[PDB]
């Protein structure tokens, strides 16, 4: 950790991501994840970055950022979980990280799904299901997506179950 693989690598990966034309390469996501975990002393900047990147641009970033946060979230959760997930306010470590995200996931998801279309919207929906199943954000479906009205509203002209 001698000034090697600092925020540069992280930010660099994300930046290059958006620079793409709706490609979303898993490689990038990996770098961000491994990096975050490798450096739990920067959960703030990290989580904050991905978060902003999402709400930043429309569906485009929405979907992309979503995937990124997903990977980091899972890993982070397991990490802190291994010891004890506890927090109150402001960033500090994995714990605070997950908490912060869950406090913004509302606008993030909602926006993503909305700005997203049948295709994109579909990806988000699936991801959400896996999240609950796995046990990432054990908040009993936050008000955010909680209100099915979210999908129903954004749900363009199309049949469904």
């Amino acid at each position: 950790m001698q000034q090697d693989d600092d925020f540069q690598n992280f930010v660099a990966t994300l930046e290059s991501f958006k620079d793409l034309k709706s490609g979303i390469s898993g490689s990038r996501i990996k770098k961000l994840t491994t990096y975050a975990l490798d450096h739990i002393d920067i959960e703030s900047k990290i989580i904050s970055l991905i978060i902003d990147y999402s709400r930043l641009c429309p569906d485009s970033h929405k979907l992309g950022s979503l995937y990124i946060i997903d990977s980091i979230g899972r890993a982070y959760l397991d990490e802190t979980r291994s010891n004890s997930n506890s927090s109150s306010n402001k960033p500090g470590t994995c714990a605070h990280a997950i908490n912060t995200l869950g406090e913004v996931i509302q606008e993030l998801l909602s926006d993503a799904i909305a700005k997203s279309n049948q295709d994109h919207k579909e990806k988000i929906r699936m991801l959400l299901d896996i999240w609950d199943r796995s046990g990432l954000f054990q908040k009993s479906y936050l008000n955010a997506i909680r209100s099915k009205c979210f999908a129903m509203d954004l749900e363009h002209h199309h049949h469904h179950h």
């Binding site: 898993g26 990977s71 899972r74």
Partner: peptide, 12 residues
């Protein structure tokens, strides 16, 4: 595009 595209959350 050969770059391990399509990142699924169900698979790390």
């Amino acid at each position: 595009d050969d770059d391990e595209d399509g990142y699924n959350p169900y698979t790390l």
